Design a protein that fits this description.
Layout: E1 2-4, H1 24-29, E2 38-41, E3 46-49
Antiparallel strand pairs: 1-3, 2-3
PDB class: neurotoxin
Keywords: neurotoxin
Assembly: monomeric
């Protein structure tokens, strides 16, 4: 499904910088702990595709950004 990577720390959606293939955001999405074969930045949002249903992601069970 879709998974807008968020700021694990405790802020809001996870932002990026240069559009296109991400550097650390690309390895954080293709990680074997996710199971995704796609992921880029929509303007400044690290979008991720492949996040299983057991992978928590925006929104958050606590923060309501």
């Amino acid at each position: 499904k879709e998974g807008y990577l968020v700021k694990k720390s405790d802020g809001c959606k996870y932002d990026c910088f240069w559009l296109g293939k991400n550097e650390h955001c690309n390895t954080e999405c293709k990680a074997k702990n996710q199971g995704g074969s796609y992921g880029y930045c929509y303007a400044f949002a690290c979008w991720c595709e492949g996040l299983p249903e057991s992978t928590p992601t925006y929104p958050l069970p606590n923060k309501s950004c």
